[PDB]
Amino acid sequence: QNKDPDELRSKVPGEVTASDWEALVGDTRYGYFDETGDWSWKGYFDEQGKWVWNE
Amino acid sequence: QNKDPDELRSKVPGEVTASDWEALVGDTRYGYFDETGDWSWKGYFDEQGKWVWNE
Numbered sequence A, B: 001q002n003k004d005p006d007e008l009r010s011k012v013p014g015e016v017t018a019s020d021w022e023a024l025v026g027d028t029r030y031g032y033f034d035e036t037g038d039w040s041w042k043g044y045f046d047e048q049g050k051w052v053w054n055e
Helices: A018-022 B018-022
Strands: A015-017 A031-033 A039-041 A043-045 A051-053 B015-017 B031-033 B039-041 B043-045 B051-053
Touching: A015 A018, B015 B018
Parallel strands: none
Antiparallel strands: A015 B015, A031 A039, A043 A051, B031 B039, B043 B051
């Protein structure tokens, strides 16, 4: 399983890679599957590599 | 000379590092300074390394 929202950040600080995002695909803490069946995100990694939300 | 936002993208494909954002700092297209001098971002890089706005 994945880490919880407050804590989560990229394996390496300041560097976000495809793994940092793909680990989160399908995990409904971090997004949802839209009308068409397409993953959409509820946040993103910031310059630091910290995960932030949209709102 | 940063590219414009539709064309912009990460220096190394499949990877985003601070330097990719560092180049944008003080490019008013991509963020702005508040009155105390903090820089706010108007968007972020996505998994493909493309700029996207906080819509």
